[PDB]
Structures are given as C-alpha cells and as structure tokens.
Amino acid sequence: MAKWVCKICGYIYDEDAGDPDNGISPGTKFEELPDDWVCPICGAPKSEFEKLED
Ligand SMILES: [Fe+3]
C-alpha cells in the first residue's frame, strides 16, 4: 500500500503498518485516518503529509 511522509519531521506513515499504538490497525489508508489523527512523532496534522508517489 502507499507511504506518506510528514513534511515536518520525516516520519513515514506506511499504510501497511498503520499506527497501532495510536489506534490504527495495519492496512488503514491515509484517507481513512480520523480527522484528528496527527503525526505520532511531531504532532503535525494530516495536512502536512505528502504521498510518496510521482
Ligand atoms: Fe511529523
């Protein structure tokens, strides 16, 4: 699945890994993340992520 980078800190949200420590099971697409999910490292909102795709 896709990977998205936090433009502030460089954390990669990997849809295959999810973010289970913050309530997100593996396989959750970035668009399916709750509106108040933030970067687990720096706290940036979803708006600050970019999909790693051409
Ligand atoms: Fe971040």
Swiss-Prot record:
Fe cation binds at C6, C9, C39, C42. Keywords: Electron transport, Iron, Metal-binding, Transport. Residues 2-52 form the Rubredoxin-like domain. The keyword Magnesium does not apply. Extremely thermostable, being unaffected after incubation for 24 hours at 95 degrees Celsius. GO terms for biological process: alkane catabolic process. Binds 1 Fe(3+) ion per subunit. One of its GO terms (molecular function) is electron transfer activity. Belongs to the rubredoxin family. PANTHER family: RUBREDOXIN (PTHR47627), RUBREDOXIN-1-RELATED (PTHR47627:SF1). It holds the Pfam family Rubredoxin. This is Rubredoxin. InterPro entries: Rubredoxin, Rubredoxin-like_dom, Rubredoxin_dom, Rubredoxin_ET, Rubredoxin_Fe_BS. Rubredoxin is a small nonheme, iron protein lacking acid-labile sulfide. Its single Fe, chelated to 4 Cys, functions as an electron acceptor and may also stabilize the conformation of the molecule. Its cofactor is Fe(3+). It comes from the Archaea.
